[PDB]
Each structure stands twice: as C-alpha cells, then as structure tokens.
Design a protein around this motif. Structure first.
Motif, PDB file in Angstrom:
ATOM      1  N   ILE A 199      17.242  -6.914 -35.217  1.00 54.92           N
ATOM      2  CA  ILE A 199      18.573  -6.358 -34.972  1.00 54.92           C
ATOM      3  C   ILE A 199      18.482  -5.216 -33.966  1.00 54.92           C
ATOM      4  O   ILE A 199      17.665  -4.314 -34.130  1.00 54.92           O
ATOM      5  N   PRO A 200      19.304  -5.267 -32.904  1.00 58.40           N
ATOM      6  CA  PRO A 200      19.308  -4.240 -31.859  1.00 58.40           C
ATOM      7  C   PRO A 200      19.419  -2.829 -32.427  1.00 58.40           C
ATOM      8  O   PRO A 200      20.304  -2.570 -33.242  1.00 58.40           O
ATOM      9  N   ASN A 201      18.504  -1.954 -32.014  1.00 60.76           N
ATOM     10  CA  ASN A 201      18.473  -0.537 -32.410  1.00 60.76           C
ATOM     11  C   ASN A 201      18.139  -0.286 -33.885  1.00 60.76           C
ATOM     12  O   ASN A 201      18.157   0.856 -34.346  1.00 60.76           O
ATOM     13  N   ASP A 202      17.829  -1.356 -34.616  1.00 65.07           N
ATOM     14  CA  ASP A 202      17.227  -1.253 -35.944  1.00 65.07           C
ATOM     15  C   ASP A 202      15.834  -0.647 -35.785  1.00 65.07           C
ATOM     16  O   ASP A 202      15.058  -1.122 -34.955  1.00 65.07           O
ATOM     17  N   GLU A 203      15.501   0.392 -36.548  1.00 69.67           N
ATOM     18  CA  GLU A 203      14.140   0.898 -36.377  1.00 69.67           C
ATOM     19  C   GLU A 203      13.175   0.350 -37.422  1.00 69.67           C
ATOM     20  O   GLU A 203      11.977   0.547 -37.312  1.00 69.67           O
ATOM     21  N   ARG A 204      13.672  -0.454 -38.354  1.00 69.54           N
ATOM     22  CA  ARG A 204      12.811  -1.087 -39.342  1.00 69.54           C
ATOM     23  C   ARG A 204      11.855  -2.057 -38.656  1.00 69.54           C
ATOM     24  O   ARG A 204      12.250  -2.774 -37.724  1.00 69.54           O
ATOM     25  N   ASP A 205      10.608  -2.072 -39.123  1.00 65.60           N
ATOM     26  CA  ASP A 205       9.595  -3.004 -38.631  1.00 65.60           C
ATOM     27  C   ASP A 205       9.370  -2.864 -37.133  1.00 65.60           C
ATOM     28  O   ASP A 205       9.178  -3.859 -36.425  1.00 65.60           O
ATOM     29  N   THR A 206       9.392  -1.622 -36.655  1.00 70.45           N
ATOM     30  CA  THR A 206       9.243  -1.357 -35.229  1.00 70.45           C
ATOM     31  C   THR A 206       8.058  -0.458 -34.932  1.00 70.45           C
ATOM     32  O   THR A 206       7.563   0.270 -35.802  1.00 70.45           O
ATOM     33  N   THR A 207       7.605  -0.518 -33.687  1.00 67.87           N
ATOM     34  CA  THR A 207       6.638   0.441 -33.175  1.00 67.87           C
ATOM     35  C   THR A 207       7.068   0.841 -31.775  1.00 67.87           C
ATOM     36  O   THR A 207       8.116   0.418 -31.305  1.00 67.87           O
ATOM     37  N   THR A 208       6.256   1.649 -31.111  1.00 65.56           N
ATOM     38  CA  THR A 208       6.455   1.917 -29.693  1.00 65.56           C
ATOM     39  C   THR A 208       5.171   1.520 -28.994  1.00 65.56           C
ATOM     40  O   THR A 208       4.117   1.533 -29.616  1.00 65.56           O
ATOM     41  N   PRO A 209       5.251   1.134 -27.718  1.00 65.09           N
ATOM     42  CA  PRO A 209       4.037   0.771 -26.981  1.00 65.09           C
ATOM     43  C   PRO A 209       2.925   1.812 -27.130  1.00 65.09           C
ATOM     44  O   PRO A 209       1.770   1.455 -27.398  1.00 65.09           O
ATOM     45  N   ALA A 210       3.288   3.084 -26.990  1.00 65.82           N
ATOM     46  CA  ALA A 210       2.320   4.167 -27.040  1.00 65.82           C
ATOM     47  C   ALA A 210       1.715   4.318 -28.430  1.00 65.82           C
ATOM     48  O   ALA A 210       0.518   4.543 -28.567  1.00 65.82           O
ATOM     49  N   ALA A 211       2.550   4.212 -29.457  1.00 67.72           N
ATOM     50  CA  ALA A 211       2.079   4.322 -30.828  1.00 67.72           C
ATOM     51  C   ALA A 211       1.121   3.180 -31.160  1.00 67.72           C
ATOM     52  O   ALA A 211       0.037   3.406 -31.709  1.00 67.72           O
ATOM     53  N   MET A 212       1.524   1.959 -30.824  1.00 71.66           N
ATOM     54  CA  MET A 212       0.719   0.776 -31.106  1.00 71.66           C
ATOM     55  C   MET A 212      -0.614   0.818 -30.360  1.00 71.66           C
ATOM     56  O   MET A 212      -1.662   0.511 -30.926  1.00 71.66           O
ATOM     57  N   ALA A 213      -0.581   1.216 -29.093  1.00 75.15           N
ATOM     58  CA  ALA A 213      -1.802   1.261 -28.293  1.00 75.15           C
ATOM     59  C   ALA A 213      -2.837   2.234 -28.870  1.00 75.15           C
ATOM     60  O   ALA A 213      -4.014   1.899 -28.995  1.00 75.15           O
ATOM     61  N   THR A 214      -2.393   3.436 -29.222  1.00 78.95           N
ATOM     62  CA  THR A 214      -3.305   4.446 -29.745  1.00 78.95           C
ATOM     63  C   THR A 214      -3.807   4.049 -31.128  1.00 78.95           C
ATOM     64  O   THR A 214      -4.987   4.197 -31.425  1.00 78.95           O
ATOM     65  N   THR A 215      -2.912   3.545 -31.973  1.00 79.02           N
ATOM     66  CA  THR A 215      -3.307   3.063 -33.295  1.00 79.02           C
ATOM     67  C   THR A 215      -4.348   1.936 -33.197  1.00 79.02           C
ATOM     68  O   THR A 215      -5.338   1.949 -33.921  1.00 79.02           O
ATOM     69  N   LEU A 216      -4.138   0.973 -32.298  1.00 76.63           N
ATOM     70  CA  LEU A 216      -5.113  -0.099 -32.109  1.00 76.63           C
ATOM     71  C   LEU A 216      -6.459   0.450 -31.618  1.00 76.63           C
ATOM     72  O   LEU A 216      -7.514  -0.022 -32.034  1.00 76.63           O
ATOM     73  N   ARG A 217      -6.419   1.442 -30.734  1.00 77.17           N
ATOM     74  CA  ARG A 217      -7.617   2.093 -30.219  1.00 77.17           C
ATOM     75  C   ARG A 217      -8.443   2.673 -31.370  1.00 77.17           C
ATOM     76  O   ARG A 217      -9.671   2.538 -31.398  1.00 77.17           O
ATOM     77  N   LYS A 218      -7.737   3.381 -32.247  1.00 71.69           N
ATOM     78  CA  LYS A 218      -8.380   4.046 -33.379  1.00 71.69           C
ATOM     79  C   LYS A 218      -8.957   3.033 -34.369  1.00 71.69           C
ATOM     80  O   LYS A 218     -10.033   3.245 -34.934  1.00 71.69           O
ATOM     81  N   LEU A 219      -8.244   1.933 -34.572  1.00 75.81           N
ATOM     82  CA  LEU A 219      -8.722   0.904 -35.485  1.00 75.81           C
ATOM     83  C   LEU A 219      -9.975   0.234 -34.935  1.00 75.81           C
ATOM     84  O   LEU A 219     -10.945   0.023 -35.656  1.00 75.81           O
ATOM     85  N   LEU A 220      -9.951  -0.083 -33.646  1.00 77.24           N
ATOM     86  CA  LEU A 220     -11.041  -0.834 -33.040  1.00 77.24           C
ATOM     87  C   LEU A 220     -12.247   0.034 -32.723  1.00 77.24           C
ATOM     88  O   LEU A 220     -13.384  -0.368 -32.966  1.00 77.24           O
ATOM     89  N   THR A 221     -12.003   1.222 -32.181  1.00 79.16           N
ATOM     90  CA  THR A 221     -13.084   2.031 -31.629  1.00 79.16           C
ATOM     91  C   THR A 221     -13.150   3.453 -32.192  1.00 79.16           C
ATOM     92  O   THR A 221     -13.927   4.267 -31.711  1.00 79.16           O
ATOM     93  N   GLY A 222     -12.336   3.755 -33.198  1.00 81.83           N
ATOM     94  CA  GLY A 222     -12.339   5.073 -33.807  1.00 81.83           C
ATOM     95  C   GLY A 222     -13.239   5.152 -35.024  1.00 81.83           C
ATOM     96  O   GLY A 222     -13.866   4.175 -35.412  1.00 81.83           O
ATOM     97  N   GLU A 223     -13.283   6.319 -35.647  1.00 81.77           N
ATOM     98  CA  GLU A 223     -14.222   6.558 -36.731  1.00 81.77           C
ATOM     99  C   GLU A 223     -13.642   6.194 -38.099  1.00 81.77           C
ATOM    100  O   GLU A 223     -14.356   6.210 -39.097  1.00 81.77           O
ATOM    101  N   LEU A 224     -12.354   5.859 -38.133  1.00 77.35           N
ATOM    102  CA  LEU A 224     -11.697   5.579 -39.409  1.00 77.35           C
ATOM    103  C   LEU A 224     -12.379   4.467 -40.200  1.00 77.35           C
ATOM    104  O   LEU A 224     -12.860   4.689 -41.312  1.00 77.35           O
TER     105      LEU A 224
END
Length: 263
Positions: A148-173
């Motif tokens: 649904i347009p402008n619904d923020e449920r089940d959403t991310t942002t390019p920047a948020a997703m990119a950094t989160t993926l970085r941390k999952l793949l190559t971070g210490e978590l």
C-alpha cells in the motif's frame, strides 16, 4: 558511477515509479552511489535474509539448532511454498527452512522461521538491537507484500538495508560460521536469474535475494564482485509501477549492466 545513476533515473521515468538505489563498498563501508537512500520501500522477500540472520544469531547463542526438525500441517501452507509443500510428512530442519526461504522464496518456510524467533515484532527488535532503527517487519506471508502506497509496514530504506546486510555478512554480530552460512544460502539463490545475475560476467561472485509484491514492487539486495569474491553491496527497490514483472526485471538488469560496465 553517474551512468548507473542515469539508469536508475531512466527506470524511474519509464516505470513511472520511485526507484531506490545504493552501492556500498564492502571493505570500507563507504557509499559509492545512492538514489532515494532515505525513502521507504516494501521489502517483500528480501526480508528473508534478515530473518535467517536472526535465526543464525539464535543458533550462535544456542537458542536454536540448525539440525532441529520442525513439523507442520497443510493448513500452515500459504501461497507459493515450492519446498515446504513437499515435506508435510517428514518435516524440515531449520537449516532446510532457511535454504528454501532464501534460495526459493518459500513463503511457508519464512512463516515457520518467523514463528521460531517470535514473529515480525521480534525480527524488528532483532534489527533494532543491531543498530537498524528504520527497517520494520509487521505482517506475515503473504500479507507483507501488500505494498500500500506510503504504508510503512514491512518496509526498509535502501541505506538501512545496505548497512544491515553489510553487518550481517561482514560484521562481528554473527559468528564467522554463521556469516558464511548466510552468504552461502544467498549464493545459491535460484529465483533471481533475470536480475543482477543477468549482467554478471563469467567468474564473478554473487550472493543475492530478490523480492516481488503487489503494486509493482520489485527488489534485490546483493553482495557481488569480480574473481569469485564479493567486494560491493548493491540494494535496489522499486514500488508503485503498473508495469509487468518482466519489464521490472529488465529495468533492474539494465541498472546491473551499468554497475558492472563501470565497476
């Protein structure tokens, strides 16, 4: 590269819809390119990588075991469950569930795994605690694709997703073993063929996860690079278009072609 930016702008005009884009250097973490990086887009099945990230973090802490077997009923089966609909009798291990969720976008697999971690709110709490206060999962499959347009449920942002993926793949978590397993699942992706992969020169590494939903929503997250090793993360979403899945596929592929050409 600017030419890649032009392709994203190309796509945004031709699809008549917002397109978000991020190029991220894996080593340094520096942003190479961006377009609408702070705008929200439906995650669709790209969320399943984050989901199995949470699962693996539980495996690390011993709250979960990859070999644990889960049984389920025909009632738990929702739309598009290619793998889980074949194991009603014998069930599936947590590892097999992540494999189906990630390589094949199995929706029932994703729901079963959501259940093991406590649901959408607990995935969102997981992301929050690893420093992503933007991405949110709210619903289950298949409803989380409603877009649904402008619904923020089940959403991310390019920047948020990119950094989160970085941390999952190559971070210490996650443990090194868990990082490796997550990228191994992504490398084995079987449902992203006509997207980034279609631009890949022979001998390139790619680990990705695509998504599709209602209201023209399409997306992909990826770690890729030349010579069998990933060196860059790419995130690309679009939503709002009336265009076919096929044109949306070709638009992402064009952006991928520019990405590789100007690597």
């Amino acid at each position: 590269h600017p030419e890649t930016l032009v392709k994203v702008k190309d796509a945004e005009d031709q699809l008549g819809a917002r397109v978000g884009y991020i190029e991220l250097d894996l080593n340094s973490g520096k942003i190479l390119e961006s377009f609408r990086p702070e705008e929200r887009f439906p995650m669709m099945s790209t969320f399943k990588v984050l989901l199995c990230g949470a699962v693996l973090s539980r495996v690390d802490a011993g709250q979960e075991q990859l070999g644990r077997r889960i049984h389920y009923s025909q009632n738990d089966l929702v739309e598009y469950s290619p793998v889980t609909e074949k194991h009603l009798t014998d069930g599936m291990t947590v590892r097999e569930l992540c494999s189906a969720a990630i390589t094949m976008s199995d929706n029932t697999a994703a729901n079963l795994l959501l259940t093991t971690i406590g649901g959408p709110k607990e995935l969102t709490a997981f992301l929050h605690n690893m420093g992503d206060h933007v991405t949110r999962l709210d619903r289950w499959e298949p409803e989380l694709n409603e877009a649904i347009p402008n619904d923020e449920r089940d959403t991310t942002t390019p920047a948020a997703m990119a950094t989160t993926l970085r941390k999952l793949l190559t971070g210490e978590l996650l443990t090194l073993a868990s990082r490796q397993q997550l990228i191994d699942w992504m490398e084995a992706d079987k449902v992203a063929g006509p997207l980034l992969r279609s631009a890949l020169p022979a001998g390139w590494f790619i680990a990705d996860k695509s998504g599709a939903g209602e209201r023209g929503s399409r997306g992909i997250i990826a770690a890729l690079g030349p010579d069998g090793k990933p060196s860059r993360i790419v995130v690309n979403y679009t939503t709002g278009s009336q265009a076919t899945m096929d044109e949306r596929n070709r638009q992402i592929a064009e952006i991928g072609a520019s990405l590789i050409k100007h690597w």
